[PDB]
Amino acid sequence: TICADGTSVANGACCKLIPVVKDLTENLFEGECGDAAHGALRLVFHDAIAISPTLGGGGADGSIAVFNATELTFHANTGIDDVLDAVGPFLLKHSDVMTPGDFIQLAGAVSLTQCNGAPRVKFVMGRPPPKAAAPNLLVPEPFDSVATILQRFGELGFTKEETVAVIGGSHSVAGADDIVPNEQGIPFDQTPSIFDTQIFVDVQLRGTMIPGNGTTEGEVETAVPGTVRLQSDHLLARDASTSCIWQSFVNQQSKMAQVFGEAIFKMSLLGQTQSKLIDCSEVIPRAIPFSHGPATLPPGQTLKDIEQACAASPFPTLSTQPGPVTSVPAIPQAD
Ligand code: HEM
Ligand SMILES: [Ca+2]
Ligand SMILES: [Ca+2]
Ligand SMILES: [Mn+2]
């Protein structure tokens, strides 16, 4: 079926989403991989991961928005209020054509297409409205152990490979708003606007500093000024279960994107039954091709600054980015 804009879709029920996609790219993200995009991507996780085989939750159901009055009381959802201040108006204005679970997954898929190198993901629709808030304690925290993280993702059907890719890849295009005291938009990698493998490098370096004037639980030292490091990421890069996977993505941008894309789609299905869903992948914008060069060490760092953790292979012999040590700019906030 050809929609009013000229897009061909397999299922004409998808055409009603074309204006949503246009509104998101023009008016929420404004064609940029900035804070609005980061918030939409984070919201995918906080909505979808909040499901457990034994404790409940509906998964990718829109509960984080519909039942925000409850879910925003949960410590792990700190800062989701500010994300919803930017994204929530769009969810409401498009609530005539799609459920909130569908909206959140669409917005995350469209957000990725605003970022250099990020994959175009598959997108399906048909998720029913949510029944209840998620239980608390289903969203992983940055102070959770690797065993805890792997049990949560593993019990939901993710491989360790997918787990590392989706966490680390997301953190390629992301900052911390509620970790560094009184500071917002502190990136996890040197390039929060670029879906590259700098995150994997940046985290493997020996940490030497903390930004700002104190710490939050689940923060550790970082190696690059103007960035922050989560304990979870730190540990994922170093634990024997995951460290070789972490290392495997360094300077493997295409492989990391492919795995990331598949993991996001899997995440988008949590709590759902794939049988009742309709593919609307044609409505997703085209991706921006990765247009940067190889991964590099940050200025001033050398391979002796890498903390080797993978026993099977040495860390890749990357060149060092030329120039003086510089601080990474903070991300201007949408809210
Ligand atoms: C073990 C898993 C994870 C932990 C513990 C974790 C932790 C965090 C923390 C603590 C922040 C900062 C929040 C704040 O200061 O308000 C953050 C930011 C973010 N996370 Fe993760 N995260 C994980 C997985 C993921 C996944 C799977 C995705 C996406 C599907 C994701 C996407 C993001 C994005 C995009 C941001 C940046 C938001 C912004 O710039 O405003 N996270 N994460
Ligand atoms: Ca949910
Ligand atoms: Ca990056
Ligand atoms: Mn933010």
Ligand 1 within 6 A of CB of 177: yes
Residue 26 makes CB contacts below 8 A (sequence gap 6+) with none
Q: Give me the CATH code for the 12-139+265-283 domain, please.
A: 1.10.520.10
Technique behind the model: X-ray
* Euclidean distance between CA atoms 185 and 176, whole angstroms: 6
For strand 124-125 and strand 229-230, is the pairing parallel, antiparallel, or unpaired? unpaired
Query: Where in the chain are the domains?
Result: 12-139+265-283, 146-252+292-305
Ligand 1 within 6 A of CB of 42: yes
End-to-end alpha carbon distance in the chain: 38
Q: Is 46 a catalytic residue?
A: yes
Annotated binding site for heme b: 45, 171, 175, 177-178
Q: What is the DSSP letter of 222?
A: B
What are the C-alpha distances in Å from 141 to residues 231, 242, 281?
Answer: 9, 17, 31
Active-site hit among 38, 46, 94, 234 = 46
Given the CA of residue 177, which atom of ligand 1 is nearest to it? 15
Burial class of 53 by CB neighbour count within 10 A (0 to 12, 13 to 18, 19+): exposed
| DSSP codes, 98-125 | S-HHHHHHHHHHHHHTTSBTPPPPP-EE
248 touches 242 (CB < 8 A): no
Phi and psi based region of residue 310 (left: phi greater than 0; alpha: psi -120 to 50; beta: remaining): beta
Residues less than 5 Å from ion ligand 4, measured at CB: 35, 177
Q: 236 φ, ψ to 5°? A: -60, -40
- Bridge partners, 186 (sequence order): 176
Q: Which two tokens stand for residue 13?
A: 């029920």
- Choose among 309, 307, 188: nearest CA to 241: 309
Q: What is the DSSP letter of 79?
A: T
Ligand 1 within 6 A of CB of 179: yes
Given the CA of residue 152, which atom of ligand 1 is nearest to it? 1
Ligand 1 within 6 A of CB of 35: yes
* Euclidean distance between CA atoms 55 and 150, whole angstroms: 17
Which one of the ligands is nearest to 175 CA? Answer: 1
CA atoms within 13 A on the CB side of 318: 30
* CA 78 / ligand 3 centre spacing (Å): 23
What dihedral do alpha carbons 37, 42, 45, 48 form, nearest 10°?
A: -60
Q: Which two tokens stand for residue 328?
A: 């990474």
* Euclidean distance between CA atoms 89 and 85, whole angstroms: 7
| Planar angle of CA 176, 292, 118, nearest 5 degrees | 55
Q: Which helix (H) or strand (E) holds 220?
A: strand 219-220
Q: Which two tokens stand for residue 231?
A: 């304990």
Alpha helix locations (H) across the chain? 18-23, 35-48, 63-66, 68-71, 80-93, 100-112, 146-155, 160-170, 198-204, 231-236, 243-248, 253-268
146-252+292-305 under CATH 1.10.420.10, yes or no: yes
- Bridge partners, 297 (sequence order): 320
Residue 49 makes CB contacts below 8 A (sequence gap 6+) with 59, 138, 139, 140, 152, 153, 156, 267, 270
What's the sign of the alpha-carbon dihedral 147, 112, 32, 295?
Answer: positive
Residue appearing with tokens 């917002």: 184
* Euclidean distance between CA atoms 328 and 160, whole angstroms: 30
* CA 297 / ligand 1 centre spacing (Å): 23
Q: Which two tokens stand for residue 98?
A: 């799609």
Ligand 1 within 6 A of CB of 38: yes
Annotated binding site for Mn(2+): 35, 177, 333
Residue 235 makes CB contacts below 8 A (sequence gap 6+) with 145, 146
- 3-state SS, 273-318, equals CHHHCEECHHHCCCCCCCCCCCCCECCCCCHHHECCCCCCCCCCCC
Q: Which two tokens stand for residue 41?
A: 């991507």
101 touches 44 (CB < 8 A): no
* Euclidean distance between CA atoms 81 and 145, whole angstroms: 26
Residue 267 makes CB contacts below 8 A (sequence gap 6+) with 44, 45, 48, 49, 60, 158, 166
